[PDB]
Design a protein around this ligand. Structure first.
Ligand SMILES: O=C(O)/C(S)=C/c1ccc(F)cc1
Ligand SMILES: [Zn+2]
Ligand SMILES: [Zn+2]
Length: 217
């Protein structure tokens, strides 16, 4: 498991496979996203808590992989996901989201992502296939998951709790009666999962989805 850290230790990238890395930043509260190394540029799943960390993350991966960050997929409109949106927009990085996530971003005072993702959207960056899926309300009204069909890797985002999470966390924006159905929708769509990246904590497998179901009881 190859891990690479910034000079301060607040940003780390860990390799899942040749072209897929998890990025983790400390805001201490760690948060995860993905880095996809594609033939057409780097694509991130999620930014980071604020613009300072987002700039550092972009600069680390551009230097390491020797290509530009071209696109980011924003999985919901909380700061751990979208806090670096100002940095993305001013650098000409495309910030993909559902329309609901964009609406919520604007309501909460953040610059707006594109609002281009539908309930199911299939993107392709070079040879890298990316599917985004809105499974329903859960951790937030707008949360989406991201699927890499060439690897059967699911980015659960904050809809999915890690093994170390012993409760649901802050549920102020959550829908705890719909969250279980939303997880079941993920389990029904993706029946063979190799790795599940939660929004916070260690990478796991389908067991993290079952763990989240148990925390909802
Ligand atoms: O638990 C999490 O994954 C998150 S991202 C919680 C959260 C953050 C900001 C809020 F306003 C509400 C909840
Ligand atoms: Zn959140
Ligand atoms: Zn979160």
């Amino acid at each position: 498991k190859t891990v690479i850290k910034n000079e301060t230790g607040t940003i780390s990238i860990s390799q899942l496979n040749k072209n897929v890395w998890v990025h983790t930043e400390l805001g201490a509260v760690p948060s995860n996203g993905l880095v996809l190394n594609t033939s057409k540029g780097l694509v991130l799943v999620d930014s980071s808590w604020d613009d300072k960390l987002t700039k550092e993350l972009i600069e680390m991966v551009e230097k390491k992989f020797q290509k530009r960050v071209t696109d980011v997929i924003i999985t919901h409109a909380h700061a751990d996901r979208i806090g670096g949106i100002k940095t993305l927009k001013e650098r000409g990085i495309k910030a993909h989201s559902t329309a609901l996530t964009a609406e919520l971003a604007k309501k909460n005072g953040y610059e707006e992502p594109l609002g281009d993702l539908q309930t199911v959207t299939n993107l392709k960056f070079g040879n890298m296939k990316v599917e985004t899926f809105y499974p329903g309300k859960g951790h937030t009204e707008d949360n989406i998951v991201v699927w890499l069909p060439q690897y059967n890797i699911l980015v659960g985002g904050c809809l999915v709790k890690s093994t170390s999470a012993k409760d649901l966390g802050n549920v102020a924006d959550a829908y705890v009666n719909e969250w279980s159905t939303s997880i079941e929708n993920v389990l029904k769509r993706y029946r063979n999962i190799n790795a599940v990246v939660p929004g916070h904590g260690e990478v796991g497998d389908k067991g993290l989805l079952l763990h989240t179901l148990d925390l909802l009881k």
